[PDB]
Structure 1
Amino acid sequence: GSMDKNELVQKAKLAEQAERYDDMAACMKSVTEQGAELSNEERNLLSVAYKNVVGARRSSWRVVSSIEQKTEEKKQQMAREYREKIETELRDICNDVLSLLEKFLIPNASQAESKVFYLKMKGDYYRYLAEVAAGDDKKGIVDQSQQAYQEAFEISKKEMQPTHPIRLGLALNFSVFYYEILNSPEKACSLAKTAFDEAIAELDTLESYKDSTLIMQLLRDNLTLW
């Protein structure tokens, strides 16, 4: 009762317009912690703000982690420490989202498409946490992703037409998880095609229209260059 859950959703949309996602993500973190279930709008604002915020760090991470090896001491330590600064900055974002998901979002979502949407995210952020992840704890975070993705794939693979964008995306990100993360170029295309061919069958159905095709394109673009 200590605050206004609505003004926050507004501040979150006013921050988006001003293109200040760090601000936008913060306003949405506050909204999620209110307890109420996220409406489709609020749910996007959240997914949007955080993917935009972690996005910048993952991108900067690769950039700096690359020039680190190429210039692979004083000239490399300069780049090494900077990638570790970003890495933890990135690890923080993931942990806020991941907590927001397992503690509020996921356990509190009726719509199966929400349970697969939030769960897709869980699979996603654990994966970003796996990318920059190094050492032993690695294999462990790589597993948290696989399971979260699988727990979602099976839900959609029993709740959504193969033409539905969310399920397509789930298949898309999942397949990428197998290729890049779990070094399994086999299983990689396995679900890629499957979810793609299955999507083509009812392709003559699809509003969903655009996004559905956009993804299948990526789904296919992946298959091609894989």
Structure 2
Amino acid sequence: DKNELVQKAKLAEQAERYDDMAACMKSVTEQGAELSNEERNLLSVAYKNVVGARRSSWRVVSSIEQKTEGAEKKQQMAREYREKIETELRDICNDVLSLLEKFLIPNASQAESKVFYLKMKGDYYRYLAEVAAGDDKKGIVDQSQQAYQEAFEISKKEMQPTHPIRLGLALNFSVFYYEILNSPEKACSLAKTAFDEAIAELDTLSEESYKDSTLIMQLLRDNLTLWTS
């Protein structure tokens, strides 16, 4: 059944049916054995598409709600629809965070895996923080920060500075500082230091992953340039 569920997931992916792809990978995770690298990446892609559709729609509607200030009926419709999108978004992050807490994080037996799932834990708390307001927002921001910080410690201690997971973590944690903590100096510092450490050790690139590494380096620098300018 395991190998079957993964096949169905890749078929779903080809078909661009990400709900199906995510359901298959959720079933696999719940069987309880660590995921191989391939399975972990399938799970990540599946849920990024499922959640990202709602995040994209939420930004659009939230921009509309903001533009219809002073047109009460329109702004109320946008507000109610934004609320509906948020409940979906929350249900999806709650699902992922439940998988990470029950299965992925506690069975992770290698540093690389631990970092990957703690980053993902930080990402999905960050998504919950994007649509949190008022009372619970502080605790959600705190859970995002504590997952990224743990990943960040482990990755500096165990991973080469050109490792794509280490670089992707720096990219997303710096965004978390910029957008969630409204701390651009801190976000710029984190991104510039990851870029600089990777430049210093280009001999640690490997044939297998240099394309992912050099791409993330470019994105870190693009964020720095967006944020300096």
TM-score when scaled to structure 2? Answer: 0.95
Task: Tell me the distance in 2 between the aligned counterparts of 1:36 and 1:188.
Answer: 36
Q: CA deviation at 1:58?
A: 0.5
1:44-101 residue CA offsets vs partner (Å, 9 max, x unmatched): 1100100111011101100001101111211111111111111111111100000000
Match of 1:220 in 2: 221
Q: CA deviation at 1:169?
A: 0.5
Task: Tell me the distance in 2 between the aligned counterparts of 1:39 and 1:169.
Answer: 19
Task: Tell me the distance in 1 between the aligned counterparts of 2:209 and 2:8.
Answer: 29
1:69 aligns with 2:66: yes
> Does the CA-based 8 Å contact 2:160-2:204 persist in structure 1?
no
1:30 aligns with 2:44: no
Task: Tell me the distance in 2 between the aligned counterparts of 1:46 and 1:194.
Answer: 29
Q: CA deviation at 1:20?
A: 0.1
Q: CA deviation at 1:203?
A: 1.8
Q: Secondary structure at the match of 1:158?
A: helix
Task: Tell me the distance in 2 between the aligned counterparts of 1:40 and 1:99.
Answer: 20
1:138-176 residue CA offsets vs partner (Å, 9 max, x unmatched): 011001000000000000010011111110000110000
Q: Secondary structure at the match of 1:57?
A: helix
Q: CA deviation at 1:217?
A: 0.6
Q: CA deviation at 1:111?
A: 1.4
Task: Tell me the distance in 2 between the aligned counterparts of 1:21 and 1:15.
Answer: 7
1:91-138 residue CA offsets vs partner (Å, 9 max, x unmatched): 111000000001100101111000000110000000001001112100
RMSD (Å), alpha carbons? 0.9
**Bigger helix fraction:** 2
Higher alpha-carbon deviation: 99-108 or 6-15? 6-15
Q: CA deviation at 1:208?
A: 2.0
Q: Secondary structure at the match of 2:202?
A: coil
> What percent identity do the matched residue pairs reach?
100
Q: CA deviation at 1:6?
A: 2.5
- Unpaired segments of 5 or more residues in structure 2? none
Q: CA deviation at 1:5?
A: 2.5
Task: Tell me the distance in 2 between the aligned counterparts of 1:45 and 1:215.
Answer: 19
